[PDB]
Design a protein around this ligand. Structure first.
Ligand SMILES: Cc1cn([C@H]2C[C@H](O)[C@@H](COP(=O)(O)OP(=O)(O)O[C@H]3O[C@H](C)[C@@H](N)[C@H](O)[C@H]3O)O2)c(=O)[nH]c1=O
Ligand SMILES: Cc1cn([C@H]2C[C@H](O)[C@@H](COP(=O)(O)OP(=O)(O)O[C@H]3O[C@H](C)[C@@H](N)[C@H](O)[C@H]3O)O2)c(=O)[nH]c1=O
Ligand code: NA
Ligand code: NA
Lengths: 246, 246
């Protein structure tokens, strides 16, 4: 509960935040010995980017791997880790998640996209992992403008995550934080909910506002997310661009 | 009715088609003397581009200018001329319009944008000007894909206009064409109709298809056409991008 972590495992499928954390850790001076290992899980993200920064592949669904983690580390980060941590892992070693949403709202998948749809707050959250709603170590909201798309909000979120990492890393490693309980249940969205946003139904009836929000939520730079089909079922991918002027 | 035109006035606010025509005319050899003068009318198009290619400014609402044209030229082109030719002009000298639409459909303003909205045929038309529906010298349809925007269709139209200019310029100058009468009344759209498309109403209820068509019709490269407002009435300009993939 109280002693400095000396052996940290970072499980991450995001190179940008992994590099940021690794550089932040190099700036710290801890009284007790400290080592951090980085690992990735996800073939369908950017595994070679993670390799390129020195991470190795780990499989959290390997029950032996989980026993090794419990016996070999005293703290584990889920830094945009795509694999689920099982109860056996979270029950037996302190596991901390770095989530690119503002808990308790739009938990789960692509929080900023759902925030564009439903107008709920977003941002980043550092929270404990417990075998639905881990207690929060720190979080910070970001602003969503009517011009923003999923990418624009996401970059704000990443920036705020980095800030939270710099603000909290010393206290986390020294185990010198108090958490707060979430104050509301909020809500959760899954990958299938995002796919449903992407499958545009040309016949669907709604307000222009509803429709523009779907496009903004599913526009993320040049990703091919949202699409409609013709009668032969050729897919047409759709993106929106919104600009304010003088 | 039958003799070669020897003195052509081209009134144009489109440099691209004016240059194309001027180069096409330089390739012709006519038995009788032939000269063409180019003029532009529109301060709010690209008047300095027209100047740069040697055109001079003309005002068709100058009643004296019109009398001079009638006494000084034997053929007049409206090559995307933004000023209205009055009856006095069209009644007294052969005036020919080069229209970036497929008559009789979506006559008037930005034909391809309205074709994206209403699914009517578009393309280009060369027709006589008579003091609603001049007889047609030649026209050719272009294809509209579900991925196209106003710009994509417009470039096709410009390409086909050029083709029609090359196909028809000798016959026009020699006055050796037969026209056909339009076969249907079709329809007309004005500038105010386009502005109404651009003023997005976020509360408006419709199909996603309707809404995507509005965006495609009002997307034309980086033009700031379509916009919504926030509660303070800051305008947010909107464009769509649609791409087919493998
Ligand atoms: C793969 C993919 C991503 N995106 C956008 C939306 C996302 O918010 C953004 C980043 O995607 P990403 O796969 O790197 O996801 P991450 O930003 O790492 O986060 C995702 O996984 C974490 C493990 C979870 N804790 C997060 O809740 C979940 O949203 O890119 C798309 O718009 N389309 C896509 O196909
Ligand atoms: C000025 C303006 C243009 N556009 C797009 C749509 C247009 O089809 C395209 C070209 O515009 P333009 O002003 O050069 O128009 P032109 O292509 O020269 O044609 C227009 O004037 C001729 C005299 C008329 N005969 C045509 O029916 C009318 O559409 O650019 C926009 O999307 N937004 C704009 O504000
Ligand atoms: Na704290
Ligand atoms: Na003809």
């Amino acid at each position: 509960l109280t002693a400095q972590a000396q052996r940290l495992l970072v499980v991450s499928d995001n190179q940008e935040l992994s590099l940021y954390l690794k550089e932040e850790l190099e700036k710290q001076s801890f009284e007790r010995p400290f080592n951090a290992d980085f690992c990735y899980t996800s073939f369908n993200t950017n595994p070679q980017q993670m390799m390129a920064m020195g991470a190795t592949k780990i499989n959290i669904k390997d029950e032996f791997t989980v026993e090794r983690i419990i016996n070999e580390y005293d703290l584990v980060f889920s830094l945009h880790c795509k694999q689920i941590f099982p109860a056996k892992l979270t029950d037996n070693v302190c596991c901390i998640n770095f989530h690119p949403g503002l808990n308790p709202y739009n938990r789960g998948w692509y929080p900023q996209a759902f925030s564009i749809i439903n107008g709920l707050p977003t941002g980043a959250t550092i929270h404990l992992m417990d075998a639905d709603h881990g207690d929060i170590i720190d979080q910070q909201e970001v602003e969503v403008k009517m011009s923003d798309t999923s990418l624009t909000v996401y970059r704000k979120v990443i920036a705020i995550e980095k800030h939270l990492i710099s603000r909290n890393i010393f206290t986390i490693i020294t185990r010198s934080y108090t958490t707060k309980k979430p104050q509301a249940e909020g809500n959760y969205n899954g990958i299938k909910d995002f796919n449903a946003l992407c499958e545009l139904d040309l016949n669907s009836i709604g307000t222009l506002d509803e429709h523009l929000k779907i496009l903004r939520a599913t526009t993320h730079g040049d990703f091919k997310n949202a699409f409609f089909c013709d009668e032969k079922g050729r897919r047409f991918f759709v993106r929106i661009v919104i600009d304010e002027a003088f």
